[PDB]
Amino acid sequence: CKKRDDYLEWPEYFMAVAFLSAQRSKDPNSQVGACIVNSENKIVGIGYNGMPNGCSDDVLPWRRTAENKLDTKYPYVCHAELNAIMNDVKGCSMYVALFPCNECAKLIIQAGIKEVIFMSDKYHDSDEATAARLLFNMAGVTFRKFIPKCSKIVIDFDSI
Amino acid sequence: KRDDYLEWPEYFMAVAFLSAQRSKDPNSQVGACIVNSENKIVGIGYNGMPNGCSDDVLPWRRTAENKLDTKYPYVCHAELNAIMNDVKGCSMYVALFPCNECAKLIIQAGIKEVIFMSDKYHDSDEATAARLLFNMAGVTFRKFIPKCSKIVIDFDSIN
Amino acid sequence: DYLEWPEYFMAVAFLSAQRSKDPNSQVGACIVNSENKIVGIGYNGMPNGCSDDVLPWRRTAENKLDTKYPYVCHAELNAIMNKDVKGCSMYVALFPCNECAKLIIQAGIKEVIFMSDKYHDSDEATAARLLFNMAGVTFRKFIPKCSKIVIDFDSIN
Amino acid sequence: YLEWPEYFMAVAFLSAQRSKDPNSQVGACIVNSENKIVGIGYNGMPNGCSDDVLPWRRTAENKLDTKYPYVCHAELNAIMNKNLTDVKGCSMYVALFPCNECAKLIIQAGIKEVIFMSDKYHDSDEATAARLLFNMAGVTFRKFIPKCSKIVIDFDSINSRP
Amino acid sequence: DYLEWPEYFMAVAFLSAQRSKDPNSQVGACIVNSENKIVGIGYNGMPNGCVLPWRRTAENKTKYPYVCHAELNAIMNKVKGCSMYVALFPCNECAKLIIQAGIKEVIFMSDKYHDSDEATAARLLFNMAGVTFRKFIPKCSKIVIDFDSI
Amino acid sequence: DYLEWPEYFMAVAFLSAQRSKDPNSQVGACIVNSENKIVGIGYNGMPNGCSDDVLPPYVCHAELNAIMNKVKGCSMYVALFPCNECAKLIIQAGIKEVIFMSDKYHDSDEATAARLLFNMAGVTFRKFIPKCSKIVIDFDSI
Ligand SMILES: [Cl-]
Ligand SMILES: [Cl-]
Ligand SMILES: [Cl-]
Ligand SMILES: [Cl-]
Ligand SMILES: [Zn+2]
Ligand SMILES: [Zn+2]
Ligand SMILES: [Zn+2]
Ligand SMILES: [Zn+2]
Ligand SMILES: [Zn+2]
Ligand SMILES: [Zn+2]
Numbered sequence: 001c002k003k004r005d006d007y008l009e010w011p012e013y014f015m016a017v018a019f020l021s022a023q024r025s026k027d028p029n030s031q032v033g034a035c036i037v038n039s040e041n042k043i044v045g046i047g048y049n050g051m052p053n054g055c056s057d058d059v060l061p062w063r064r065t066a067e068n069k070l071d072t073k074y075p076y077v078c079h080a081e082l083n084a085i086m087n088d089v090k091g092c093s094m095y096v097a098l099f100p101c102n103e104c105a106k107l108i109i110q111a112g113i114k115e116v117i118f119m120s121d122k123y124h125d126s127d128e129a130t131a132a133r134l135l136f137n138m139a140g141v142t143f144r145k146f147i148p149k150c151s152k153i154v155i156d157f158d159s160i
Numbered sequence: 161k162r163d164d165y166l167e168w169p170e171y172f173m174a175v176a177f178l179s180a181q182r183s184k185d186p187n188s189q190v191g192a193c194i195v196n197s198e199n200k201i202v203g204i205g206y207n208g209m210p211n212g213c214s215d216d217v218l219p220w221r222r223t224a225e226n227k228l229d230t231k232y233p234y235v236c237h238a239e240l241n242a243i244m245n246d247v248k249g250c251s252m253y254v255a256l257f258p259c260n261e262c263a264k265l266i267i268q269a270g271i272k273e274v275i276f277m278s279d280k281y282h283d284s285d286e287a288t289a290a291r292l293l294f295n296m297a298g299v300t301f302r303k304f305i306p307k308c309s310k311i312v313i314d315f316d317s318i319n
Numbered sequence: 320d321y322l323e324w325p326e327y328f329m330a331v332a333f334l335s336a337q338r339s340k341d342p343n344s345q346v347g348a349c350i351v352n353s354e355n356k357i358v359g360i361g362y363n364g365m366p367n368g369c370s371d372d373v374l375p376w377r378r379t380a381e382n383k384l385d386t387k388y389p390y391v392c393h394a395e396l397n398a399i400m401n402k403d404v405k406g407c408s409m410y411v412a413l414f415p416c417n418e419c420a421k422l423i424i425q426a427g428i429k430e431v432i433f434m435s436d437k438y439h440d441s442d443e444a445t446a447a448r449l450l451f452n453m454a455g456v457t458f459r460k461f462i463p464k465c466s467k468i469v470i471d472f473d474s475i476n
Numbered sequence: 477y478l479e480w481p482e483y484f485m486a487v488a489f490l491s492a493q494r495s496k497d498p499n500s501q502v503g504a505c506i507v508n509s510e511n512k513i514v515g516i517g518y519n520g521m522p523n524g525c526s527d528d529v530l531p532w533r534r535t536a537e538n539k540l541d542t543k544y545p546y547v548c549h550a551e552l553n554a555i556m557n558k559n560l561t562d563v564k565g566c567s568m569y570v571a572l573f574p575c576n577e578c579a580k581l582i583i584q585a586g587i588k589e590v591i592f593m594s595d596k597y598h599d600s601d602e603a604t605a606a607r608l609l610f611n612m613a614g615v616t617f618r619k620f621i622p623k624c625s626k627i628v629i630d631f632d633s634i635n636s637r638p
Numbered sequence: 639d640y641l642e643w644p645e646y647f648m649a650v651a652f653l654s655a656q657r658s659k660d661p662n663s664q665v666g667a668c669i670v671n672s673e674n675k676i677v678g679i680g681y682n683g684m685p686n687g688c689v690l691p692w693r694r695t696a697e698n699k700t701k702y703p704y705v706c707h708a709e710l711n712a713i714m715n716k717v718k719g720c721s722m723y724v725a726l727f728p729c730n731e732c733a734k735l736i737i738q739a740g741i742k743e744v745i746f747m748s749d750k751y752h753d754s755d756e757a758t759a760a761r762l763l764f765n766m767a768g769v770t771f772r773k774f775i776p777k778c779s780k781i782v783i784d785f786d787s788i
Numbered sequence: 789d790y791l792e793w794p795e796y797f798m799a800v801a802f803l804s805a806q807r808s809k810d811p812n813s814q815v816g817a818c819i820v821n822s823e824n825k826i827v828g829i830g831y832n833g834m835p836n837g838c839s840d841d842v843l844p845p846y847v848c849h850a851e852l853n854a855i856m857n858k859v860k861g862c863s864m865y866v867a868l869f870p871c872n873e874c875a876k877l878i879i880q881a882g883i884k885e886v887i888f889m890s891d892k893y894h895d896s897d898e899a900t901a902a903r904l905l906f907n908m909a910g911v912t913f914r915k916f917i918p919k920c921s922k923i924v925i926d927f928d929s930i
Contacts, residue, residue, distance in 0.1 A: 001186065001221035008181035019313045020174055023166035031165075032318075042245055046201060052424040054454035057161045075417050075446035078425060086425035087200055097318045102389050103418065109366040110392060110400035120318040127382070131389035139368040148315045155177045155311040159189075160255045160278045210583040213612040226601075233576050233605035236584060244584035246559060260545050261577065267522040268548060268556040289545035297524040322806040330803055333925045337791035356858060357826050402825060412930045435930040461927075468925040470802045472918050475815075475867045475890040478656035486653055489783045493641040502788070512715055513679060558675060571788045594788045620785075627783040629652045631776045634665070634725045634748040685879040687909040696904060699897035704905065706876055714880040731873060734848055737835040738856040763846070767835045 008153070010041055014095045015119060015146055016153050021048045022080065022097055026057040027073065029064060034084040035095040036113065044092060047083025051076055079104050085111045093117060095146070099124070102131035109135060115142040166311070168199060172253045173277060173304055174311050179206045180238065180255060184215040185231070187222060192238040192254040194247050194271065202250060205242030209234055237262050243269045251275060253304070257282070260289035267297040274301040322468070324355055325410075329434065329461050330468050331357065332410045336394070338362045341387075342376055348394035349410040350402070350428065358407055361398025365390055395419035399426045408432060414439070414458070417446035424454040431458040478627070480511055484569040485593060485620055486627050487513065492550070492571055494518045497543070498532055504550040504570040506563050506587070514563050517554025521546055551578035555585050563587060573598065573617070576605035583613040590617040641781070643674055647723040648747060648774050649781055651708075654681045655725055660705065667712035668723040669741065677720060680712030707732050713739045721745060723774070727752070730759035737767040744771040791923070793824050797865045798889060798916055799923050800826065801850075805867055807831045809839060810847070817850035818865045819858075819883065827862060830854030849874050855881050863887060869894070869913070872901035879909045886913045 008016070014035050022033030025048045036045035051060050060076045069075060081096060081104035090112030094100075099121040100108060108116065116136065123129050136143050166174070172193050180191030183206045194203035209218050218234045227233060239254060239262035248270030257279045258266060266274065274294065281287050294301055322330070328349050336347030339362045350359035365374050374390045383389055395415050405427030409415075414436040415423060423431065431451070438444050451458055478486070484505050492503030495518045506515035521530050530546045539545060551574050555563060564586030568574075573595040574582060582590065590610065597603050610617055630636075641649065647668050655666030658681045669678035684690060684704055696703035709724060709732035721743040728736060728744060736744060744764070751757045764771050791799070797818050805816030808831045819828035830853030833839060834846055851866060851874035860882030869891040870878060878886060886906070893899050906913050 001219065003184040003215040003220055004186050007184055008178070010182070013178070013182055015315065016178055016313050017175070019315060019317070020166070020171070020178060020311070023311070023313075024168070024171055026161040026165055028162050031162075043201070043204060052421050052450055052454055053427075054424070055450060056453070059453065062161050069442050070446060075442065076421075076450060078421050082421065083425065086422070106366050106390075106392050106396065107400070107422075109368070110397065112367075119315055122319070127384055127389070131384060135366060135369065135390060138370075138373060139366055146315075151314065151316050153178070153181070153313040155174050155313070156309065157173070157177060157277060157306045158309050159177070160280075210580055210609055210613055212614055213583075213609060217612070218608075228601055228605060233601070234580075234609060236580050240580065241584060244581070264522050264546075264548050264552065265556070265581075267524070268553065270523075285539055285545065289540060293522060293525060293546060296529070297522055321809045322803075324807075327803065327807055329927065330925045331800065333927065333929070334791075334796065334799055334803065334923070337923070338793075338796055340790055357829060360826060434927060437930075463927045466926070466928050468803070468806070470799050470923040470925070471921065472798065472802065472889055472916075473921060474802070476892055477659050478653075480657070483653070483657055485785065486783050487650065489785065489787070490641075490646070490649055490653060490781070493639075493781075494643075494646055496640065513676065516676060593785055596788070622785050625785050627653075627656075627785075629649050629781040629783065630779060631648065631652060631747055632779045633652065633655075635750060685876055685905060685909050686882070687879070690908065692904055692908075696901055699900055703872075703901060704908075706880055710876070711880060714877070730845075734835060734852070735856070735877075737837075738848055738852060740836070759845070763835060766841060766846075767837050 009149065011146070012148055012150065012153070014043070015117070015148065017043065017046060018080075018095045018097055020155075021046050024048045025050055026062070027077070028062055032080040032097045034080040034097070036084050036089050036092050037095065038089070038092050044089050045084040045087045047080045047085070047087055049080045050078060050083070052078055082107055085113075089113060098122065099129055099143070100132050101128040102135060105132035105135040109139045109141060113141065115144075117144055117146050119146050119148075121145065167307065169275075169304065170307050170311070172201070173275070173306070175201065175204060176238070176253045176255055179204050182206050183208055184220075185235070186220050190238040190255050192242040192252055194242050194250050194252050196247075196250050202247055203242045203245045205238045205240065205245055207238045208236060208241070210236055240265055247271055256280065257287055257301075258290050259286040260293060261286075263290035263293045267293060267299060272299055274299060275304050276301065277304050279303065323464065325432065325461060326463060326465065326468075328357070328410045329432070329463070331360065332394075332412060335360045335362045336412065339364055340370070341391070343378065346394040346412055348398040348412075350398050350404050350407050351410065352407050358404055359398040359402040361394045361396065361401050363394045364392060364397070366392055393419050396422055399423070399428075404428055410461070413437070414444055415447055416443040417450065420447035420450045424450060424456060429456055431456065432461050433458065434461050436460065479623065481591070481620065482622055482624070482627070484513070485591070485622065487516065488569045488571055490629070491516050491518045495520055496526065496528070496532070497547070499534060502550040502571045504554040504568055506554050506558075506566050506568050508563075508566050514560060514566055515554040515558040517550040517552065517557055519550045520548055520553065522548055549575065549578050552581055555581055555587075559585075567591060569620070572596070573603060574606055575602045576609065579606040579609045583609060583615055588615060590615060591620050592617065593620045593622075595619060644723075644745070644774065645776055647676070648745070648776065650676065650679065651723045651725050652747075654679050655708070657681050658683055665708040665725045667708040667725070669712050669716050670721045670723065671718060672720075678712040678716030680708045680710065680715060682706065682708045682711070710735055717741055726750065727757055727771075728760050729756040730763060733760040733763040737763060737769055742769055744769060745774045746771065747774050747776075749773060792919070794887070794916065795918055795920060795923070797826075798887070798918065800829065801865045801867050801889075803925075804829050804831045805850070808833055815850040815867045817854040817867070819854050820863050820865065821859075822861060828854040828858040830857055852877055859883060865916070868892075869899050870902050871898040872905060875902040875905045875911075879905060879911055884911060886911060887916050888913065889916050889918075891915065
């Protein structure tokens, strides 16, 4: 009687926590998650994109375009990376579904996170992503693309 | 806003079930998740051998002549590991109702509520003693009823 | 004539501003708990390990990547990252922008005490007020009993 | 004067006298690298369950009428009695060599050393399991050899003639 | 026999006192929070990193110029709204530390020096600052720790 | 022309002194860790709860209050060189360095005993020599 060979390994596990957390998002157009892990391979912070604490997802607007900027989500929304850090984390790594914008890059650096592991870099050519890479390069923060062993993971509550 | 997002009860129990998938135990995979009053996760655990103890030398079987040739003298339950990963005033989501030994730890850690998926062994001495201890310590417990039976995580969904 | 706690903490925020290497704008911030301990201090600048003269400080340029705005960190962000702060109050020179407002709310800060609100009618300021209103974070203008405070190191001798 | 190892073991033994267990009293003391006491424990019922309602007896018709299902060992209580954040890297002084269930806790807590006075149950299965886990995990353990066998605490000593 | 919390805490203070290398006085202190956790332990002695040199110079410029008191050491090892168990009623300097530490109660075994100026000054400081002090009355005078007992 | 850390921290010490209701003298102290974070601030005054008391001994020094207000390996910035009682507190707290502005009571018994204790225990004491002589906080600047 020996150990399992088919268990979930730690890299897929941490990114899966990020993607699971993203499913909590009330944003109809974008759901992103983040997971911060320390040198002990323990999770120290988790976040998803949404409105700030105490603020109703049925009181602030979710639309991406409007005549007045104040009628869009952008003045109000918190990115997954911000929420994970606000949930020390110095010498840690962040698993993220999407390469961080430059504003998140600032927080990541000031939080003392030394490594960002991303699933998608879909907006690589964006100003936001270009500024983020430059900040990480100057700060000595690693960023690398996650290459998963599997494309999907099933949580079955009836397995118990 | 979306009207199909993952709600927090299902999320916290999903975290416990995901963590259980890391277990090297061939017969039982159990996870637990501790959550504070701000609805933040403060601890996650699954069942396994202690830190630095190889899953190859230590036995995984459930029965043998000598108990030292079974997993029971060596294995750490999900609840222990969740706690060892303060937690005073928190809630614990766990796939299986805690044993009495886990109940002791849960009480001494200051956990106030236990939310469980399965109570398979309700009539066991372990579960019976666990309930009494919780009753006396003022730790409440309740069965979790999922909004659905499965959750799929797709890493390609971001693309 | 002794300095009061609020004057002291606003003084610490303004003092902290003088640490800034921004050639055009110097801003400071101080975070305090209910026991009147300073829990965080911040000033505006580039992220840790950066602008060793390398990132731009200019306010206008051909494209925004040549300006400081994609790179610079506000005093409020740095104060929060400079040491939890749940149940604390933040002393700021200027009313925080909506981006700092998000961070303040998520940090669990419950009170912002500001000197100036000169951009009150801006979208950034408006969004900040709305978010604080919804999150239950109060904000009040600081009324100093003294406009100036002099620190002379030779005063002791 | 009392040296530090004798002192920390004496705190463990003194703490055991807090126990309401009428047949066995065990104490444990957790100490960090600066010789600061970071946790103290003794054997007892869990928090909120100590008001002389649970059974202390060792034999009965039914196991649920004994102490064993309910009692917390000293090591468990010391660890749970202050994770000032944590007790990682600390040493535990305990009256008896820990059982294998306490071994699990001690390992997962990040304790690096166990100093014990008695190993009277060393030929036990539980003791063998404990040693295996400690040795595998890299937790060092050593038997305490005290400079003296008895320590007297006297409240009159502050007022009395030396 | 069985020890109640107060006897246990005073016993920790007295046990700690035995670590002292001071030949003239051995004093201990034990600081306890509202949940009966020990948050600080101290005994009297010389400063950290120290026959100490220059003693005659220090004496001329008390007979104990270098000593650090049990109460000072317990506080430095710690204190919210705690209680302090101490073998000997605190002096006036220790009273200030205890007040500034936030300690609300001092439980003392000996008040040998009640009529001293230090103790009088200490009582006044405690009364001004709202810090309770009360004399501890033990059951048995002696507690024996026997390492063979297991 | 930006303020550097040492001047900043001594300025905080001097700013803290102005919290003092003591009409005779005002001293301040600021404790800093190796990451340049303020971890404790103090000024001289009456014990907690006793600021409305006058008693024609009672006073708590800046250094004591800074340590009580929240430090092993830290540095303390102080407006005045510590007395011997504060030196004991500084040593037992594990503070490694005292940076002082004034030592105008150097030949006193108190300051001499303090130096002796710091010498025995290996606490470094450093005369602060500031770049700028004065700093002005201007609330109307915003
Ligand atoms: Cl793009
Ligand atoms: Cl940009
Ligand atoms: Cl805006
Ligand atoms: Cl066994
Ligand atoms: Zn972002
Ligand atoms: Zn269990
Ligand atoms: Zn801002
Ligand atoms: Zn045990
Ligand atoms: Zn004293
Ligand atoms: Zn002094």
